[PDB]
Amino acid sequence: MNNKEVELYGGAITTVVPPGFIDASTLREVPDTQAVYVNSRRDEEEFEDGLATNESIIVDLLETVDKSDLKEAWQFHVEDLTELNGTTKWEALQEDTVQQGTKFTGLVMEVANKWGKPDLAQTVVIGVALIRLTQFDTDVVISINVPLTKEEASQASNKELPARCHAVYQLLQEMVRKFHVVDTSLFA
C-alpha cells in the first residue's frame, strides 16, 4: 500500500491513512475522543490499494476496560461497536496479537442480529484494532467499516475472505504498527 502519515488530535498522535481519505473534522465537528476519516475517492481514480470508495476509519480514545487479557479486552470493545448495530453474535474472520499485552487486531462480521434476519440487508465487515495505553488508562480502538458489495457478501457467506477485506486488514495492521504518541499531554 501507499498509506501516508497523518496527525491526529492536534498533532499529539500520528498514524497513517490511505490516499484519497479525508479528515471529516475539516468539514464537520466529530466527537472529542475521535478522529474520523472517510474514503473520498472518485470511482474513476485508480489506486493499487485494493480499496473501493466507501470505507471509513474511526480512531477512538476510550477508558481502559477492566479486563487483563488482551484478546478479552479486544472482544469487549468489539461487542460495544457491534451491539449498536443490533448485532447479537459476531465472528472474527481474522485475528492476531500484534504485540503481547498491548496490540490486537481482527476483522469482525455479524452472524446474528436481534431481528433474527442476518441477511435482511447489506453486510458490513469491520476491522477492529485495540492499542492499550496502560500508562494513561486509555484503550485506543481503531475501527474501519467495509460495506460489502453483493458479490463480497456472497464470498463471506461462502467462508471466503474478499480481497478488499484482506486489503482493509493490511491497512488496519499498518495503522497499528505506525501508531505513535507524540505528545503525552493529550492524556494530562
Backbone phi, then psi, for 105, in 5-degree steps?
-135, 155
Class for the domain spanning 1-188: alpha beta
The SS3 call for residue 9 is helix
Residue 100's Cβ-count burial label (10 Å; 0-12, 13-18, 19+) is exposed
Backbone phi, then psi, for 85, in 5-degree steps?
-90, 5
CA distances, 85 to each of 57, 89, 112 (Å): 17, 11, 11
Sign of the torsion formed by the C-alpha atoms of 58, 59, 61 and 66: positive
DSSP 85: T
94, three cell numbers: 481474522
Under a CB-based contact definition with an 8 Å cutoff, are residues 98 and 173 in contact? yes
In whole angstroms, give the CA distance from residue 117 to residue 179.
37
Terminal CA-to-CA distance of the chain, rounded, Å? Answer: 35
The SS3 call for residue 65 is coil
- Resolution in A, one decimal? 1.9
Beta strands in the chain (DSSP E): 4-8, 13-17, 21-23, 34-39, 56-63, 87-99, 103-113, 124-133, 138-147, 180-181
Runs of H (alpha helix) within 66-139 = 70-83
**Cβ of 147: how many Cβ atoms within 10 Å?**
14
C-alpha torsion 33→87→176→38, nearest 10? -60
Question: Which amino acid is it at 73?
Answer: A
Residue 1's Cβ-count burial label (10 Å; 0-12, 13-18, 19+) is middle
Under a CB-based contact definition with an 8 Å cutoff, are residues 91 and 109 in contact? yes
179: Cβ contacts below 8 Å, ≥ 6 apart: 13, 14, 15, 131, 140, 142
The SS3 call for residue 92 is strand
In whole angstroms, give the CA distance from residue 20 to residue 164.
16
Domain ranges of the chain: 1-188
